[PDB]
Design a protein around this nucleic acid. Structure first.
Length: 224
RNA sequence: GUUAAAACUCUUCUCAUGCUGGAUUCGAAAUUAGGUGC
Protein backbone atom coordinates (compact mmCIF):
# COMPACT_ATOMS: atom_id res chain seq x y z
CA UNK A 1 0.00 0.00 0.00
CA UNK A 2 1.95 2.99 -1.36
CA UNK A 3 1.14 6.50 -2.65
CA UNK A 4 2.03 8.90 -5.40
CA UNK A 5 2.32 12.29 -3.67
CA UNK A 6 2.66 15.24 -5.99
CA UNK A 7 2.70 18.99 -6.43
CA UNK A 8 1.11 19.78 -9.78
CA UNK A 9 1.26 23.30 -11.19
CA UNK A 10 -1.44 24.63 -13.48
CA UNK A 11 0.38 25.98 -16.52
CA UNK A 12 -2.91 26.62 -18.33
CA UNK A 13 -6.23 27.31 -16.65
CA UNK A 14 -8.85 24.63 -16.10
CA UNK A 15 -12.65 24.53 -16.03
CA UNK A 16 -15.18 22.01 -14.68
CA UNK A 17 -18.85 23.10 -14.98
CA UNK A 18 -20.98 21.80 -12.10
CA UNK A 19 -24.77 22.16 -12.15
CA UNK A 20 -26.86 25.37 -12.20
CA UNK A 21 -23.88 27.61 -13.04
CA UNK A 22 -21.12 26.62 -10.61
CA UNK A 23 -17.51 25.82 -11.56
CA UNK A 24 -15.01 23.69 -9.65
CA UNK A 25 -12.50 25.61 -7.48
CA UNK A 26 -9.96 22.79 -7.92
CA UNK A 27 -9.65 19.77 -10.22
CA UNK A 28 -11.34 16.63 -8.98
CA UNK A 29 -9.82 13.17 -8.70
CA UNK A 30 -12.38 11.86 -11.17
CA UNK A 31 -10.69 14.06 -13.79
CA UNK A 32 -7.22 12.91 -12.73
CA UNK A 33 -8.57 9.39 -13.26
CA UNK A 34 -10.20 10.12 -16.61
CA UNK A 35 -7.15 11.80 -18.07
CA UNK A 36 -4.82 8.97 -16.86
CA UNK A 37 -7.37 6.61 -18.37
CA UNK A 38 -6.92 8.21 -21.79
CA UNK A 39 -3.17 8.15 -21.17
CA UNK A 40 -3.06 4.43 -20.36
CA UNK A 41 -5.49 3.78 -23.21
CA UNK A 42 -2.87 5.10 -25.59
CA UNK A 43 -0.01 3.54 -23.57
CA UNK A 44 -1.51 -0.03 -23.83
CA UNK A 45 -1.64 -0.82 -20.10
CA UNK A 46 -3.90 -3.07 -17.96
CA UNK A 47 -4.78 0.02 -15.90
CA UNK A 48 -6.49 1.28 -19.10
CA UNK A 49 -8.37 -1.99 -19.49
CA UNK A 50 -9.65 -1.67 -15.91
CA UNK A 51 -10.49 2.12 -15.85
CA UNK A 52 -13.95 1.43 -17.20
CA UNK A 53 -15.05 0.20 -13.79
CA UNK A 54 -15.83 2.90 -11.17
CA UNK A 55 -15.76 0.50 -8.19
CA UNK A 56 -12.17 -0.34 -9.23
CA UNK A 57 -10.39 0.17 -5.86
CA UNK A 58 -6.63 -0.38 -5.79
CA UNK A 59 -5.60 2.79 -7.56
CA UNK A 60 -7.74 5.53 -6.06
CA UNK A 61 -7.49 9.16 -7.15
CA UNK A 62 -8.23 11.52 -4.29
CA UNK A 63 -9.33 14.94 -5.52
CA UNK A 64 -6.76 17.59 -6.10
CA UNK A 65 -7.12 20.08 -3.29
CA UNK A 66 -4.68 23.04 -3.48
CA UNK A 67 -1.48 23.66 -1.53
CA UNK A 68 -1.33 26.86 0.54
CA UNK A 69 1.71 29.08 1.04
CA UNK A 70 2.31 27.35 4.40
CA UNK A 71 3.23 24.00 2.79
CA UNK A 72 -0.05 22.46 3.93
CA UNK A 73 -3.38 21.46 2.45
CA UNK A 74 -6.63 23.44 2.21
CA UNK A 75 -9.78 21.97 3.77
CA UNK A 76 -13.43 22.82 2.92
CA UNK A 77 -19.41 22.33 5.31
CA UNK A 78 -21.72 25.05 3.96
CA UNK A 79 -18.55 26.85 2.88
CA UNK A 80 -17.99 27.10 -0.88
CA UNK A 81 -14.33 27.86 -0.25
CA UNK A 82 -11.20 26.25 1.18
CA UNK A 83 -9.41 27.03 4.45
CA UNK A 84 -6.17 25.69 5.88
CA UNK A 85 -5.28 24.83 9.53
CA UNK A 86 -2.52 27.46 9.44
CA UNK A 87 -5.48 29.84 8.75
CA UNK A 88 -3.43 31.98 6.37
CA UNK A 89 -5.40 31.62 3.14
CA UNK A 90 -8.94 31.39 1.84
CA UNK A 91 -9.10 29.91 -1.64
CA UNK A 92 -12.39 30.59 -3.30
CA UNK A 93 -14.48 32.26 -5.95
CA UNK A 94 -11.92 34.99 -6.43
CA UNK A 95 -9.91 32.44 -8.43
CA UNK A 96 -12.69 32.11 -11.01
CA UNK A 97 -12.35 34.31 -14.00
CA UNK A 98 -15.07 34.55 -16.60
CA UNK A 99 -14.01 34.07 -20.18
CA UNK A 100 -16.02 35.36 -23.07
CA UNK A 101 -14.68 33.88 -26.24
CA UNK A 102 -16.35 33.99 -29.67
CA UNK A 103 -19.82 32.72 -28.84
CA UNK A 104 -18.81 30.94 -25.67
CA UNK A 105 -19.50 32.02 -22.09
CA UNK A 106 -17.68 29.97 -19.46
CA UNK A 107 -15.39 30.42 -16.45
CA UNK A 108 -12.06 28.96 -15.36
CA UNK A 109 -9.84 28.92 -12.34
CA UNK A 110 -6.56 30.70 -13.06
CA UNK A 111 -3.14 29.09 -13.28
CA UNK A 112 0.09 29.62 -11.34
CA UNK A 113 -1.08 27.64 -8.29
CA UNK A 114 -0.23 24.21 -6.91
CA UNK A 115 -2.36 21.11 -6.35
CA UNK A 116 -1.95 17.72 -4.68
CA UNK A 117 -1.50 14.32 -6.33
CA UNK A 118 -2.24 11.30 -4.14
CA UNK A 119 -2.89 7.89 -5.75
CA UNK A 120 -3.21 5.21 -3.12
CA UNK A 121 -2.18 1.99 -4.77
CA UNK A 122 -2.84 -1.08 -2.62
CA UNK A 123 -1.26 -3.79 -4.77
CA UNK A 124 2.26 -3.31 -6.10
CA UNK A 125 1.45 -4.47 -9.66
CA UNK A 126 -0.65 -1.35 -10.06
CA UNK A 127 2.14 0.61 -8.34
CA UNK A 128 4.44 -0.25 -11.28
CA UNK A 129 1.55 0.49 -13.68
CA UNK A 130 1.23 3.89 -11.98
CA UNK A 131 5.00 4.55 -12.01
CA UNK A 132 5.03 4.28 -15.80
CA UNK A 133 2.35 6.92 -16.30
CA UNK A 134 3.89 9.21 -13.69
CA UNK A 135 7.09 8.98 -15.72
CA UNK A 136 4.89 9.77 -18.72
CA UNK A 137 3.12 12.89 -17.35
CA UNK A 138 6.46 14.23 -16.09
CA UNK A 139 7.57 14.03 -19.72
CA UNK A 140 4.59 15.77 -21.35
CA UNK A 141 1.46 16.84 -19.48
CA UNK A 142 -2.01 16.04 -18.10
CA UNK A 143 -5.19 17.84 -19.12
CA UNK A 144 -7.91 18.37 -16.49
CA UNK A 145 -11.31 19.94 -16.98
CA UNK A 146 -13.19 20.53 -20.18
CA UNK A 147 -11.68 21.74 -23.47
CA UNK A 148 -8.67 19.41 -23.24
CA UNK A 149 -7.93 19.57 -26.97
CA UNK A 150 -7.92 23.38 -27.10
CA UNK A 151 -5.16 23.39 -24.46
CA UNK A 152 -6.93 24.21 -21.17
CA UNK A 153 -5.83 22.68 -17.89
CA UNK A 154 -2.20 21.66 -18.28
CA UNK A 155 -0.56 20.51 -15.04
CA UNK A 156 3.17 19.83 -14.71
CA UNK A 157 4.22 17.54 -11.87
CA UNK A 158 7.00 19.15 -9.90
CA UNK A 159 7.45 16.30 -7.38
CA UNK A 160 6.92 12.57 -7.98
CA UNK A 161 7.26 10.95 -4.55
CA UNK A 162 6.38 7.28 -4.00
CA UNK A 163 5.18 7.55 -0.37
CA UNK A 164 3.71 4.80 1.87
CA UNK A 165 0.23 4.46 3.33
CA UNK A 166 -0.53 4.43 7.02
CA UNK A 167 -4.26 3.80 7.17
CA UNK A 168 -6.64 5.92 9.26
CA UNK A 169 -9.02 4.85 12.04
CA UNK A 170 -11.76 7.27 13.11
CA UNK A 171 -15.50 7.57 13.76
CA UNK A 172 -13.20 12.15 10.63
CA UNK A 173 -13.43 15.05 8.09
CA UNK A 174 -14.45 14.52 4.46
CA UNK A 175 -11.96 15.95 1.97
CA UNK A 176 -14.40 15.23 -0.88
CA UNK A 177 -18.01 14.16 -1.48
CA UNK A 178 -19.19 10.76 -0.18
CA UNK A 179 -22.02 8.97 -2.01
CA UNK A 180 -24.34 7.76 0.77
CA UNK A 181 -27.88 7.28 -0.58
CA UNK A 182 -27.31 12.30 2.45
CA UNK A 183 -28.22 15.33 0.33
CA UNK A 184 -25.26 16.48 -1.84
CA UNK A 185 -25.73 16.24 -5.59
CA UNK A 186 -22.66 14.75 -7.24
CA UNK A 187 -22.63 14.42 -11.03
CA UNK A 188 -20.00 12.69 -13.20
CA UNK A 189 -19.51 10.80 -16.46
CA UNK A 190 -18.61 7.43 -17.97
CA UNK A 191 -17.35 8.34 -21.46
CA UNK A 192 -16.68 5.04 -23.23
CA UNK A 193 -14.07 5.10 -26.02
CA UNK A 194 -14.26 2.11 -28.47
CA UNK A 195 -18.00 1.97 -27.75
CA UNK A 196 -19.08 5.52 -28.79
CA UNK A 197 -21.08 5.67 -25.56
CA UNK A 198 -21.29 8.66 -23.25
CA UNK A 199 -23.53 8.67 -20.19
CA UNK A 200 -23.92 11.24 -17.42
CA UNK A 201 -24.08 9.26 -14.19
CA UNK A 202 -25.72 11.30 -11.40
CA UNK A 203 -25.64 10.44 -7.69
CA UNK A 204 -26.50 11.85 -4.29
CA UNK A 205 -24.43 11.68 -1.13
CA UNK A 206 -22.63 13.71 1.52
CA UNK A 207 -21.11 17.18 1.30
CA UNK A 208 -17.47 18.11 1.96
CA UNK A 209 -17.62 17.76 6.52
CA UNK A 210 -18.24 16.25 9.90
CA UNK A 211 -18.46 12.47 9.66
CA UNK A 212 -18.43 9.46 12.00
CA UNK A 213 -17.32 3.36 12.34
CA UNK A 214 -15.55 0.71 10.27
CA UNK A 215 -14.46 3.20 7.54
CA UNK A 216 -12.79 0.47 5.45
CA UNK A 217 -11.63 2.84 2.73
CA UNK A 218 -11.28 6.59 2.12
CA UNK A 219 -12.43 9.22 -5.67
CA UNK A 220 -15.57 10.97 -4.53
CA UNK A 221 -15.55 9.82 -0.95
CA UNK A 222 -12.29 10.79 0.75
CA UNK A 223 -11.76 11.63 4.43
CA UNK A 224 -8.88 12.45 6.78
C1' G B 1 -10.45 6.00 -20.30
C1' U B 2 -12.43 13.76 -17.14
C1' U B 3 -20.89 16.43 -16.65
C1' A B 4 -17.22 14.58 -21.64
C1' A B 5 -16.69 15.96 -27.31
C1' A B 6 -17.27 20.48 -30.64
C1' A B 7 -16.61 26.16 -31.04
C1' C B 8 -9.55 30.72 -32.58
C1' U B 9 -11.94 36.90 -28.44
C1' C B 10 -12.83 37.49 -34.12
C1' U B 11 -13.93 41.93 -37.26
C1' U B 12 -13.54 47.43 -38.28
C1' C B 13 -9.67 52.00 -37.12
C1' U B 14 -2.26 54.69 -40.72
C1' C B 15 1.15 57.96 -33.53
C1' A B 16 -1.15 61.56 -36.69
C1' U B 17 -1.04 66.77 -36.28
C1' G B 18 1.86 71.85 -35.36
C1' C B 19 7.63 73.60 -35.60
C1' U B 20 13.08 75.93 -41.93
C1' G B 21 20.09 73.36 -38.30
C1' G B 22 19.13 78.34 -37.69
C1' A B 23 22.70 82.06 -35.65
C1' U B 24 28.22 84.41 -35.16
C1' U B 25 33.01 84.87 -38.49
C1' C B 26 35.84 89.12 -45.66
C1' G B 27 40.75 83.27 -48.42
C1' A B 28 43.88 87.08 -46.68
C1' A B 29 48.45 87.48 -44.83
C1' A B 30 54.11 87.94 -47.88
C1' U B 31 56.50 88.74 -53.06
C1' U B 32 58.04 95.62 -58.22
C1' A B 33 57.01 91.68 -65.17
C1' G B 34 62.22 92.04 -63.22
C1' G B 35 66.83 90.91 -65.75
C1' U B 36 69.17 91.33 -71.23
C1' G B 37 70.40 94.77 -76.46
C1' C B 38 72.16 102.37 -78.35
Amino acid sequence: MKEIKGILESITGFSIPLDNGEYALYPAGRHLRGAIGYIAFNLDLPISSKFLDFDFDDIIFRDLLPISKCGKIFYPKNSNSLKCPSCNEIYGSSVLRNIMARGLSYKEVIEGKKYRLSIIVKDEKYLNEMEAIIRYILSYGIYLGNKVSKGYGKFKIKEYSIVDILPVKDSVLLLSDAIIDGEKDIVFSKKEISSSKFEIIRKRGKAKDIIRNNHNGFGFGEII
